[PDB]
Design a binder for this molecule. Structure first.
Ligand code: NI
Length: 341
């Protein structure tokens, strides 16, 4: 059964609610982004209207074979009417195609559903600036002050400089980047750009990236592994055994691997600066964990909410334990008292 925090009151609508069968009274199913915990349950047999971004729509049609007649793509930053209700999709600064959804209820209530997001001051000048929001359904993934991490730009600087140094010292080194979902494409595209290479990958991953409207993509990616010195591999294979095995397959073209695992937060964040990050090394293999996040830090989240001043907050992440829920509610109250709303 569908949990309450996936239902939008006063509407026929649900958000990211595809794993519960036919939801009673739902007339339109919104999908914020193509990540499996959110799309879980969609397939070619789905016959209700799905509302989403253009990019999410390309992925539904090509990867899950959802039929075209049930895919309803909406442009961003544009007022649209869905089953009698005005909605707007906003960029979520998450993965490609990820959106936040503004609903304008017929009684005058305005609701923002963030989906998954990385809050940014640039959001304070979107169509959110133009009216009051009463209820916020908030991505609280990292809602605790221990969660600090650098900007995406600092992380990419670290990765480009690390890769360019290693390959210039040893032109026979291979760079490998882990992946298991869409998102974080900048990691492998930035590194391939500094090295003058295309990114090589499986046919299935090439297909996925071809759905993303990224400019000049035919110029940056390929299925010909032999022509490429940046390879993408499943995240599970980014370990010493998996990488040793891959190096064997390259036919003596390379004699060293430098590999990157973009994680979210890890507790090495509480002690160490990005400058000071070091790899794990075994023989001719080194592995870097880099803290490239597509979710808000605690401070980014706090800034957004204190700017928005919602009347009520409904968390959508970490809702399963009483300790988590109590912790989150304490921070929301602090934020409200400090800012004065
Ligand atoms: Ni996500």
């Amino acid at each position: 059964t569908c949990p309450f925090y996936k239902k939008i009151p006063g509407t026929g609508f649900t958000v990211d609610a595809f794993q519960y069968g036919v939801v009673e009274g739902c007339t339109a199913y919104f999908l914020t982004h193509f990540h499996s915990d959110h799309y879980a349950g969609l397939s070619k047999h789905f016959t209700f209207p799905v509302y989403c971004s253009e990019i999410t729509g390309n992925l539904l049609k090509n990867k899950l074979h959802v039929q075209e007649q049930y895919i309803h793509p909406l442009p961003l930053d544009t007022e649209c009417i869905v089953n009698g209700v005005k909605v707007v999709l906003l960029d979520a600064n998450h993965c490609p195609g990820a959106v936040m959804i503004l609903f304008y209820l017929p009684n005058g209530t305005v609701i923002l559903h963030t989906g998954d997001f990385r809050a940014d001051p640039s959001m304070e000048r979107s169509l959110l600036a133009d009216q009051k929001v009463h209820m916020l359904y908030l991505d609280t993934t990292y809602c605790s002050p221990e969660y600090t991490f650098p900007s995406q730009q600092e992380v990419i600087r670290f990765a480009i400089n690390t890769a360019f140094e290693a390959v210039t010292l040893n032109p026979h080194a291979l760079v490998v980047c882990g992946t298991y979902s869409i998102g974080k494409e900048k990691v492998f595209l930035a590194i391939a750009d500094v090295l003058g290479s295309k990114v090589g990958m499986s046919q299935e991953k090439y297909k996925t990236l071809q759905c993303l409207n990224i400019p000049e993509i035919n110029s940056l990616i390929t299925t010909d592994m032999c022509s490429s010195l940046v390879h993408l591999l499943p995240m599970m294979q980014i370990n010493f055994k998996g990488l040793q095995s891959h190096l064997k397959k390259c036919g003596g073209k390379y004699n060293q691997i430098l590999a990157f695992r973009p994680t979210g937060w890890t507790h090495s964040n509480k002690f160490t600066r990005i400058a000071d990050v070091i790899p794990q090394t075994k023989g001719n293999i080194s592995i870097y964990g880099i803290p490239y996040s597509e979710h808000s830090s605690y401070l980014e989240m706090k800034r957004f909410v204190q700017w928005l001043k919602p009347q009520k907050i409904i968390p959508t992440v970490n809702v399963g334990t009483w300790k988590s829920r109590s912790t989150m509610e304490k921070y929301f109250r602090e934020w409200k008292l400090e800012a004065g709303y």
